[PDB]
Structure formats: C-alpha cells, structure tokens
C-alpha cells in the first residue's frame, strides 16, 4: 500500500509475523499511553506497531486504548477469574514490552505446536472426498485400481447393457 506512513504494517505478512498469543484467561486488555514525555516513548511505539500484531492473533480479545488519563503509562489485563494484571511500561523499549507480555500471559511454544498438530491430525490422508477437504477423490486415480470410464472406456463385458442383453438372450 502507498498511503500510511509505515505501510509495511498494513500488510498481511506483518500481521502473521508478530508473535504473542494470549492465554485463555485474557479477555480485555487496556492500554493506557501518554503522548508527551520522553519516558512515554517506548509505549507509543508498542501501540503503533505491535498492537495491530497482537490483536490479529487474538481476534476475540477486546483491546482498548486511553490517552493521557494517567501521568504514567501502563497496561492492564482483565482475566476470566477477575484477576487484574497490571504491567508498568515506562522507560521500557517497545521490544521489552512485547517480550514481557509474552512472558506473563503467553503460550509456551510447545503449547502452540501441540495444538496446531491436534488440528492437522483432523485431515486424514486416507479418506476420499471433494478436493476441498481431501486429497484423492474417487479412487479413479490410485494406480492399481480401475480407471474411471471418463478417461479410459471400459470392457464390453463389464458394461451393464452387455450383461442385460446377454441375460435376455
């Protein structure tokens, strides 16, 4: 895209690439950030780059942002229990905020890998269906089997009307 001042962040590639996934407890996330100060600087970047990464990967988590309410910048987190997490981001680097969040409510790499494997096991090689869900379809295809008459017309013997006209006579 052309318009926008960091257009690379309106990509799909930039969206998939951001990594934080949230635990199942997180529901709401509240970013309170500040416009004017040097000590705000990191937080801002986080909103401007990382917030749109985060959200994409967690489409069900409300992410809200307030400006200039509180004189010092922070994150809040509202979990399922009624647990309220409070993450102070001040002189932090943008990267530091990201990784800190990942630490606190993340998902272990193993967790993700497990889950994706548990979904990948759902589509089984051996079934037969429409090209959408399966690979192979009619078993026209597989080598040793019979060729399906569209491609390779069948023996006079195996036709219905051959059997019919033979059983009649």
Q: For residue 126, state whether it binds other proteins (rule: CB under 8 A).
A: yes
Contacted entry of RNA, Zn ion, other proteins, none for residue 36, CB cut-off 5 to 8 Å set by kind? other proteins
Q: For residue 147, state whether it binds RNA (rule: CB under 7 A).
A: no
Cβ of residue 133: shortest distance to RNA, in angstroms? 4
Separation of alpha carbons 1 and 16, rounded Å: 17
What three-state secondary structure class fits 78? strand
> Which one of 49-57, 67-75, 142-150, 160-168 is the stretch in contact with Zn ion (CB under 5 A)?
142-150
E strand spans, 5-119: 28-33, 62-67, 74-78, 84-88
Cα–Cα distances in angstroms (integers) from residue 86 to residues 24, 37, 78, 138, in the given order? 17, 21, 9, 57
Single out the residue of 1, 71, 144, 150 in contact with RNA (rule: CB under 7 A): 150
Q: CB of 29 within 8 A of CB of 75?
A: yes
Single out the residue of 24, 117, 161, 169 in contact with RNA (rule: CB under 7 A): 161
Give 67's strand partners.
Answer: 33
> Which one of 2-10, 23-31, 53-61, 133-141 is the stretch in contact with Zn ion (CB under 5 A)?
133-141
Contacted entry of Zn ion, other proteins, RNA, none for residue 132, CB cut-off 5 to 8 Å set by kind? RNA
């Amino acid at each position: 895209p052309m318009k926008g001042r960091f257009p690379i962040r309106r990509t799909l590639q930039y969206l998939g690439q951001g990594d934080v996934v949230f635990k199942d407890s997180v529901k709401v996330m509240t970013v309170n950030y500040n416009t004017h100060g040097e000590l705000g600087e990191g937080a801002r970047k986080f909103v401007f780059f990382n917030i749109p990464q985060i959200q994409y990967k967690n489409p069900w988590v409300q992410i809200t942002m307030f400006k200039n309410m509180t004189p010092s910048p922070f994150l809040r987190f509202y979990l399922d229990s009624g647990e309220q997490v409070l993450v102070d981001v001040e002189s932090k680097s943008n990267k530091e905020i990201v990784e800190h969040i990942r630490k606190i409510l993340g998902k272990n790499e193993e967790t993700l890998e497990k889950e994706e494997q548990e979904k990948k096991q759902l589509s089984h090689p051996a079934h037969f269906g429409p090209r959408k869900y399966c690979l192979r379809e009619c078993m026209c295809e597989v080598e040793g089997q019979v060729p399906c008459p569209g491609l390779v017309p069948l023996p006079k013997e195996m036709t219905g009307k051959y059997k019919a006209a033979l059983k009649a006579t």
